[PDB]
Amino acid sequence: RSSSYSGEYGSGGGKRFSHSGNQLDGPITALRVRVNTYYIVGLQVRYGKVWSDYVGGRNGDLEEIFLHPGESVIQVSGKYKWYLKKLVFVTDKGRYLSFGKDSGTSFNAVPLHPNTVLRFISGRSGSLIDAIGLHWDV
Ligand SMILES: OC[C@H]1O[C@H](O[C@@H]2[C@H](O)[C@@H](O)O[C@H](CO)[C@H]2O)[C@@H](O)[C@@H](O)[C@@H]1O
Numbered sequence: 001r002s003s004s005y006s007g008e009y010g011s012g013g014g015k016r017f018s019h020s021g022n023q024l025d026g027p028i029t030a031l032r033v034r035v036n037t038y039y040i041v042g043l044q045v046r047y048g049k050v051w052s053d054y055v056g057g058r059n060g061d062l063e064e065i066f067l068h069p070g071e072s073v074i075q076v077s078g079k080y081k082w083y084l085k086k087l088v089f090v091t092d093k094g095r096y097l098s099f100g101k102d103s104g105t106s107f108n109a110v111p112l113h114p115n116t117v118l119r120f121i122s123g124r125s126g127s128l129i130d131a132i133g134l135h136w137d138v
């Protein structure tokens with residue numbers, strides 16, 4: 001078995017969410033992160049050609065980045081307090097896809113098993129992103 005899970009990074013507020021079902025749509029191809037002055041407000045991930053249902057709140061500006069064909073996320077770092085503040089998605093093409101504010105408790109998630117990549121995310125949300133989890137697999 002090659003699946004592994006990193007998290008949760010954040011606190012216990014909000015309601016749990018998961019993109020477990022979304023991996024049937026395809027590999028991660030794009031990221032949407034709504035950000036304000038202090039926090040990561042919301043998250044959306046594109047699996048193959050299909051965007052997940054938006055999670056989080058509305059009080060922030062939407063940032064968006066598409067992955068290149070064949071580009072996979074192989075490491076995720078970030079920062080949090082009671083809520084998520086920063087995410088950096090490191091890819092196998094050497095890109096560091098950064099969102100949010102450089103402050104708070106830091107974390108650094110890497111996959112446990114050989115040759116695995118980021119397949120989906122989970123976490124907790126409300127008006128903000130309270131917590132995030134990273135799920136790795138072949
Ligand atoms: O995700 C953050 C937070 O969202 C919800 O609470 C909101 C916040 O406390 C704040 O923005 O004020 C709102 C109205 O006063 C309030 O709804 C909850 O889902 C909470 O559990 C969660 O931590």
Ligand SMILES: [Cl-]
Nearest residue numbers: 106107108109
């Ligand atoms: Cl850590």
Ligand SMILES: [Cl-]
Nearest residue numbers: 077106107108
């Ligand atoms: Cl760290």
